Amino acid sequence: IVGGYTCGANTVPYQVSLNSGYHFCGGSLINSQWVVSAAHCYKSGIQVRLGEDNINVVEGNEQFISASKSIVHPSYNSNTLNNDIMLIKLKSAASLNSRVASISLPTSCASAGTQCLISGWGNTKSSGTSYPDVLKCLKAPILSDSSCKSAYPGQITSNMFCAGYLEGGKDSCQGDSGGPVVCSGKLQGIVSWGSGCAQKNKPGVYTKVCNYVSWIKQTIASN
Ligand SMILES: Cc1c(F)c(Oc2cccc(C(=N)N)c2)[nH+]c(Oc2cccc(C(=N)N)c2)c1F
Ligand SMILES: [Ca+2]
Numbered sequence: 001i002v003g004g005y006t007c008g009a010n011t012v013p014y015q016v017s018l019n020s021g022y023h024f025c026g027g028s029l030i031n032s033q034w035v036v037s038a039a040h041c042y043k044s045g046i047q048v049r050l051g052e053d054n055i056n057v058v059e060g061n062e063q064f065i066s067a068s069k070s071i072v073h074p075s076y077n078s079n080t081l082n083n084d085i086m087l088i089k090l091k092s093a094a095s096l097n098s099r100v101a102s103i104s105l106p107t108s109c110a111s112a113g114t115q116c117l118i119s120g121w122g123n124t125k126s127s128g129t130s131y132p133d134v135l136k137c138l139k140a141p142i143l144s145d146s147s148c149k150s151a152y153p154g155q156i157t158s159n160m161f162c163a164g165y166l167e168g169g170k171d172s173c174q175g176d177s178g179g180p181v182v183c184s185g186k187l188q189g190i191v192s193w194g195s196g197c198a199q200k201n202k203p204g205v206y207t208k209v210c211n212y213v214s215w216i217k218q219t220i221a222s223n
């Protein structure tokens, strides 16, 4: 997250850290047994870390759980990033409390201008590298579809949306991938890709979750 703020410990309860000996991606808990993340975050041997603030300090509210199964969307295109969404089944149910909560799925898609909250442990520098240990937050609006496609000609599919600031200086970044985008208390996006970070006229691109609800619901119910 570039140009954001410190969330505060466990203020974003549904936020998950994906670990393979180190933090590599963000994720969202949608129920006690499932996490949603980005397909580009796929790896063999993931451990799901819940209740996390400082990713490098054991503070007492963490639940570290191994993944039993990973399902990448049947149409994920690694070259275009079209359908960048994956489901992760937890080895055992997480314990829901005030520090670990699930985020609901949307019943409808969000409008441009809707304000959202993006969160992650990703890079905090526009151009340079600095990784935080604590969860960073950022309020950002969904951008109209025309601005999104003007910024990335021929690369935006109907499964993507832009959120951020055209003027640059505030964006999600690498390390944030798979991370949630919550608007009006529903999971509307997953951190997918971008062109650099917080650059002028190159906003963040997100998987539009609203298009995957029937796929999520059907997949979980059967696995
Ligand atoms: C090396 C690299 C990427 F390739 C990338 O995006 C991709 C990767 C693969 C395919 C495509 C594609 N258009 N076909 C785009 N995003 C990056 O930073 C990030 C990562 C996450 C968010 C942001 C962001 N600025 N919001 C930047 C990044 F550092
Ligand atoms: Ca910790």
Ligand SMILES: [K+]
Pocket: 173, 174, 175, 176, 177
């Ligand atoms: K990334």
